């Protein structure tokens with residue numbers, strides 16, 4: 001389902017990429033996207049898929065577009081248009097300077113200090129989950145760890161029932177990797193139906209949870225509205241539940257296939273942070289965009305006010321102009337250059353929490369289960385979308401090779 005080429009689009013700039021169903025997906029998700037950086041591909045193309053839109057392909061252009069909020073607005077950040085249109089999360093669908101008051105609050109909730117307060121639980125949860133796993137000599141890493149680990153820490157933070165996971169997870173998944181089971185607007189509603197009562201109650205009877213704090217905060221002198229709180233909260237949920245979950249699956253899948261990498265981390269633990277940065281770069285997974293506010297000639301191409309443009313955050317670090325031998329995992333690159341957590345005024349506030357969770361997992365897994373691999377005959381499937389994922393990650397290990405701690 002290709003849309004008719006709009007008039008302003010030079011036919012030599014056409015490249016029919018389907019962000020929801022790229023071609024050599026069998027080859028891995030990052031690889032599937034990297035066709036975009038083949039020499040036959042112009043730096044800025046128009047795809048007729050998903051209703052027609054621009055995609056920037058080069059770290060250079062992505063960052064530039066990301067910095068440029070005057071021309072490239074966050075109002076409608078998702079493709080397809082119906083979704084960017086329905087999209088109303090705060091701070092994400094706002095541009096500076098308005099964005100700034102809301103970010104400041106959200107930061108109150110997710111930033112450094114919060115991570116520092118939660119570290120012991122993060123550590124406790126990981127060790128517990130791994131240890132519980134260890135003696136079985138096999139899991140479903142996606143279901144067995146990658147989901148519970150990040151989600152439960154989130155639910156704790158948020159003050160929500162663990163019993164709510166499956167529902168929320170489903171709704172979260174519909175937004176980033178649409179099934180076709182529900183439209184974006186429907187999904188957003190259902191999450192909103194969830195959130196409202198909860199907000200209501202936290203305004204009256206505040207607690208110490210993230211939800212309570214958002215519901216009762218101040219923005220540019222006055223009190224947040226219930227609608228604004230609904231709108232930030234809905235973001236925190238999506239932010240918290242999807243990305244870390246999938247990221248661990250990519251990284252875990254790579255580690256399961258690279259003994260030499262696992263060993264490096266075991267012997268030279270001082271390298272974890274650097275490795276973490278390296279995996280963030282190679283296993284980058286987020287792809288969203290911006291809307292043209294006006295007619296704009298950007299790097300010789302004429303964009304029309306109203307045109308959407310995908311600026312894949314995933315793409316910067318995979319770009320050979322940015323990183324030599326991009327597809328190669330190297331824990332000792334002089335410079336890990338990426339925009340995994342974005343760029344510009346919208347850079348991830350959850351970055352600190354994300355990293356803490358990555359590092360703990362690496363350290364804690366490698367400790368108890370140093371040697372593991374992908375199950376004989378499992379075909380690992382990747383899914384593409386706003387956040388790309390891994391469907392299932394069947395692992396096998398010999399328990400006699402494990403160490404209880």
Ligand code: HEM
Pocket residue numbers: 077090091092103106110235236237239240241243244247285286288289313339340341342343345346347348349350351353354
């Ligand atoms: C590996 C993990 C993650 C990755 C790769 C990631 C990626 C991103 C990206 C690319 C953006 C910028 C979006 C834009 O410019 O349109 C962003 C923003 C944001 N993410 Fe993260 N995310 C991750 C985890 C988290 C976590 C754990 C949280 C906290 C619950 C979270 C909360 C946020 C928030 C609040 C924003 C928006 C901030 C603003 O608009 O100023 N994210 N994320």
Ligand SMILES: CC1(C)[C@@H]2CC[C@@]1(C)C(=O)C2
Pocket residue numbers: 089092176235238239243286287288386387
């Ligand atoms: C692109 C994102 C990863 C960022 C946090 C959750 C997400 C889906 C958004 O709506 C903004």
